[PDB]
Amino acid sequence: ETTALVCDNGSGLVKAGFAGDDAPRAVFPSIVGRPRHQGVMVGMGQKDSYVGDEAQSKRGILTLKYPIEHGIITNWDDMEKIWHHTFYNELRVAPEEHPTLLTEAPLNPKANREKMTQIMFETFNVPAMYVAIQAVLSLYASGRTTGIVLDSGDGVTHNVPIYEGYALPHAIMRLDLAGRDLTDYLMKILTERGYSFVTTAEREIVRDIKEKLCYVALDFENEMATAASSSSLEKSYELPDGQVITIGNERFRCPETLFQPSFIGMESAGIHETTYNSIMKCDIDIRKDLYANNVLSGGTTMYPGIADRMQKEITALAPSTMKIKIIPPPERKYSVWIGGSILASLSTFQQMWISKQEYDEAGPSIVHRKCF
């Protein structure tokens, strides 16, 4: 009868739907807005706070505030609000009937899972739930059983090396360089040309510019030398009001930070080094099989030409007597949700849900003992 409810709870977007499908049904930004002006107009259905896609449409008035920051939820009051919205106004189902499946980034605060389970068992009264790691669901979706995954969302970037089904918990690195940092860096470096973006609403415009105009350069120095005699690199974008801007070497300087994290003045290894370091933390016999299965998930890994530079850069580190392959699917943006649907549809998994009667016995602490 009832099957599941699979909702990937990212930092940027709330991707959600039913189990067993090939694509999520609801995809909206995870923001909640609150008005900040006089509001002298009468009627017109003025609500206290606009959440989801409606907030993005009217951003010129409200002050957007993301409830999820760096993967850790910090505004639980708004979080239950956005969950209520996605369950009622977007799917139009009763959450009390269908079990739900959730996702969380690894090495996360321990209280976060407890409070998530408590909220989903008290306010919504679901029958069952389960918390999964995104990096294993991506490899679920990819269809293989062994490999190393480089997830890269909006707030957190991490690796999980997994052999033929056996995870290695001591090789799970996690760096806090993600999409929001790139957006901030682009906003900062656009000032050199003359354009200044400050308001929370203009952060969305800068994010859109990054989404629709940025690419990863295969060779940074040669690209800079070419941009010195700037002929065919500059592009044009149209602001909502009508002004046209031109960005040149900012096109490939912004996404490079993933490879040279010193551009934001933080001493860390780029995404091409954390993968290699996480591979080198496993015992020697499996590095050959890990090298040949590199899976890219997450939205931030969707820049053009990222895979080519990842190959060209990792090949410089690994020994020369072996091959390296990266496996970017064209539909990686919903890889976590696809994997969650695949896991929820399985028959063997039906015994791993957390029953309500089980939770009443042991309290919210059951999540650590049962889920992982």
Ligand X SMILES: Nc1ncnc2c1ncn2[C@@H]1O[C@H](COP(=O)(O)OP(=O)(O)O)[C@@H](O)[C@H]1O
Contact set with Mg ion (CB under 5 A): 10, 153, 298, 336
- We find the least distance from the C-beta atom of residue 47 to a copy of itself, in angstroms, to be 12
> For residues 23 and 239, which CB has a smaller minimum distance to a copy of itself in the complex?
239
Residues in Cβ contact with 139 at an 8 Å cutoff, skipping those fewer than 6 apart:
145, 147, 149, 160, 162, 295, 339
Given the rule CB under 6 A, which of 59-67, 241-249, 294-302, 310-318 is the region that contacts ligand X? 294-302
Q: Which residue has 């790691």 as its token pair?
A: 133
> For residues 12 and 340, which CB has a smaller minimum distance to ligand X in the complex?
12
Nearest CA among 135, 142, 143, 150 for reference residue 302: 150
Residue 33 near which of a copy of itself, ligand X, Mg ion, none (CB within 5-8 Å, type-dependent): none
Count of residues of this chain found to bind ligand X when the rule CB under 6 A is applied = 20
- We find the least distance from the C-beta atom of residue 164 to a copy of itself, in angstroms, to be 7
- We find the least distance from the C-beta atom of residue 15 to Mg ion, in angstroms, to be 7
Given the rule CB under 6 A, which of 3-11, 124-132, 262-270, 285-293 is the region that contacts ligand X? 3-11
- Residue 60 binds to a copy of itself (criterion: CB under 8 A): yes
Residue 40 near which of Mg ion, ligand X, a copy of itself, none (CB within 5-8 Å, type-dependent): a copy of itself
Count of residues of this chain found to bind a copy of itself when the rule CB under 8 A is applied = 77
Distance of CA 74 to the CA centre of its chain: 17
> For residues 46 and 123, which CB has a smaller minimum distance to a copy of itself in the complex?
46
Interface residues for a copy of itself in 199-228 (CB under 8 A)?
199-202, 205
295 has which bridge partners? 149, 327
> For residues 106 and 299, which CB has a smaller minimum distance to ligand X in the complex?
299
Sign, CA dihedral 331-336-341-343, equals positive
Residue 272 near which of ligand X, Mg ion, a copy of itself, none (CB within 5-8 Å, type-dependent): none
- We find the least distance from the C-beta atom of residue 213 to ligand X, in angstroms, to be 9
- Residue 16 binds to a copy of itself (criterion: CB under 8 A): no
Interface residues for a copy of itself in 293-332 (CB under 8 A)?
318-322
Residue 133 near which of a copy of itself, ligand X, Mg ion, none (CB within 5-8 Å, type-dependent): a copy of itself
- We find the least distance from the C-beta atom of residue 130 to ligand X, in angstroms, to be 18
